[PDB]
Structure 1
Amino acid sequence: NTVHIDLSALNPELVQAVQHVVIGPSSLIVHFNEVIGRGHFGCVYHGTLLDNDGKKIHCAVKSLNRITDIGEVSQFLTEGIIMKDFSHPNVLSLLGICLRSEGSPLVVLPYMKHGDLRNFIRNETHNPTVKDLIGFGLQVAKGMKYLASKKFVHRDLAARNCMLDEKFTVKVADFGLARDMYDKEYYSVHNKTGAKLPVKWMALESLQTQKFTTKSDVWSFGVLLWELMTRGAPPYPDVNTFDITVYLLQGRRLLQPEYCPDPLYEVMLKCWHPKAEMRPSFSELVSRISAIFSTFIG
């Protein structure tokens, strides 16, 4: 209850360029007993977004508690509300933002019945077939192909960041500042800057330079496929951050899951090429995986 931002000192050209994303206080209903889920990420609430023709839209609402002042609000708008006007069936897009005077800004996302892709496939109550799992990988590849075309570098591609709707359409999400805290199991922390680093998903060059590209998104996509075909097993479970790096430097890789098609494993191994320029583009991945999915019977 200490967050105050003076909306009127926001750059007038920035507030013009983002006004179509801003939701008014009376156009979003949020009941605070109605929680979709809780975690390290914070608390995600049920919301109802009210359009102009009495059309009610079910959404998920989250306070961006990491945004505490005008400076951070500005940066967030300059990187998040321009720089994320995306529209693709396999990309989770922002429904809008509540800019508040008192309190952190709210983000409003489409409701996703089946939650994150990792938890869904780990749940033995569900039965995604081998073909279904490749189909999920295919859907992610298409979302990533779209994002690469927009020159958007995700940086945190992983099964936990892909969401599943009620029709089982996979949407690639980027919760930028939306995650309050990050699980120690998956994210290392940089001592000096506080940067969160998803080491077991990072390309070899990123483990060295801390720099991300589309080609490092391709590496992470390989790991995501591995996650899919193992039904959400943790990559490199026994192993610390230094030993993972040595493992990879030796040219060792994640091992072929049971029931994973050989052609699909070849694709994974190509994603983990040590030379970034030698990894497949997402165009190549969508082509390759589409054929694997289409011709999959056995």
Structure 2
Amino acid sequence: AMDPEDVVIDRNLLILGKILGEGEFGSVMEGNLKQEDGTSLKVAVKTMKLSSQREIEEFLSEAACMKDFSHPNVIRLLGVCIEIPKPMVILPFMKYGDLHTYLLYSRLETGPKHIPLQTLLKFMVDIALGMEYLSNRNFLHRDLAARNCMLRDDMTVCVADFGLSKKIYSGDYYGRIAKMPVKWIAIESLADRVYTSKSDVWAFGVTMWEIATRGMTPYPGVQNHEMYDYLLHGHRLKQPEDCLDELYEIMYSCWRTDPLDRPTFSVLRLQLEKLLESLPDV
């Protein structure tokens, strides 16, 4: 581990806590990071169930690039701790957790109160702003979904889970790609497993539909194994109940068969901001 970009944090400065979530490709843990002035900082730690020195050095160069992300709607990586080397990414702790679980909790009496239409649109604007920033830096996210967007203590949404994210043209580091959820994958990416910025636009449309349905799984009544054939026949996500016709037309533009017919994040973000401006206060 040469690390010329100084992204590695001394492992001894990190105290691991409770596991927040576990999956086939890693886990998220609560943690404390001892700062220079002796005061501890509450952080989240993402581990990955993978190795080589060149693979870890390439991993640290990618981490160093993500550490320079400066946008309120994009999570900022604090550093990487190493443990055969086992890397763990250190992130700021997002109080409210992921947006998907938050939408589900909102449908319970004890959870957050009923989310107004305007607040749902504001979550979509936030994600579009974050994706516009990443897209302008030539990043492909490749795993955009409401479960991968986080809520800060001020209720601003930030795009997170950069585990499959890569610059366009860069080497594909990884397997981990082939096991991703089929219901967020663009039709051309199911047929060839190749992603572009237009594949992220498709996933963004799916994420807007998740927000508008308050956390429903995409395509009710359709099984994962039928998805490619379903999309090949021209079928798309149906309009949710109480979803403005204007908002649904923005979602449907994300799922045009030809990726080149789909809009960019800059255009989507402006269309959503204009629609939100045209609505009354809550």
TM value normalised by structure 2: 0.86
Cα deviation digits, residues 186-223 of structure 1 (max 9, x gap): xxxxxx88722321111111111111011110011000
C-alpha contact 1:159 1:227 (8 A) present in aligned 2:
yes
Against the structure 1 CA distance between its residues 177 and 104, is the aligned structure 2 distance closer, same or farther, given a 3 Å change threshold? farther
Kindly state the Cα deviation for residue 257 of structure 1 after the two structures are TM-superposed.
0.5
Rounded to whole Å, the distance in 2 between the matches of 1:197 and 1:62 is 18
What is residue 49 of structure 2 aligned with on the other side? 65
Gaps of 5+ in 2: 166-174
Cα deviation digits, residues 217-239 of structure 1 (max 9, x gap): 00110000000000010011322
Cα deviation digits, residues 27-80 of structure 1 (max 9, x gap): 33x14xx315133254432222233244542101233332x4434313322433
- Higher relative contact order at CA 8 Å, sep ≥6: structure 1 or structure 2? 1
Kindly state the Cα deviation for residue 86 of structure 1 after the two structures are TM-superposed.
1.2
What is residue 187 of structure 1 aligned with on the other side? none
| Residue of 215, 218, 224 corresponding to 1:232 | 215
Q: What is the SS of the residue equivalent to 1:205?
A: helix
Against the structure 1 CA distance between its residues 48 and 242, is the aligned structure 2 distance closer, same or farther, given a 3 Å change threshold? closer
Percent identity, aligned pairs only?
44
Matched, 1:154 2:141: yes
What is residue 161 of structure 2 aligned with on the other side? 174
Instruction: Let me know the Cα RMSD of the aligned residues.
Output: 2.3
What is residue 110 of structure 1 aligned with on the other side? 92
Rounded to whole Å, the distance in 1 between the matches of 2:26 and 2:257 is 36
Q: What is the SS of the residue equivalent to 1:196?
A: coil
What is residue 50 of structure 1 aligned with on the other side? 34
Gaps of 5+ in 1: 1-9, 179-191
Kindly state the Cα deviation for residue 84 of structure 1 after the two structures are TM-superposed.
5.3
Cα deviation digits, residues 103-160 of structure 1 (max 9, x gap): 5122111101111111100112222211111110110000000000000000110111
Rounded to whole Å, the distance in 2 between the matches of 1:135 and 1:64 is 32
C-alpha contact 1:64 1:177 (8 A) present in aligned 2:
no
Against the structure 1 CA distance between its residues 194 and 257, is the aligned structure 2 distance closer, same or farther, given a 3 Å change threshold? closer
Against the structure 1 CA distance between its residues 133 and 248, is the aligned structure 2 distance closer, same or farther, given a 3 Å change threshold? same
TM value normalised by structure 1: 0.82
Rounded to whole Å, the distance in 2 between the matches of 1:211 and 1:194 is 10
What is residue 151 of structure 2 aligned with on the other side? 164
Q: What is the SS of the residue equivalent to 2:89?
A: strand
Return the letter of the residue paired with 1:173: A
Kindly state the Cα deviation for residue 177 of structure 1 after the two structures are TM-superposed.
7.0
Rounded to whole Å, the distance in 2 between the matches of 1:62 and 1:224 is 22
Return the letter of the residue paired with 2:96: H
Alignment: residue pair count: 266
Rounded to whole Å, the distance in 2 between the matches of 1:245 and 1:64 is 29
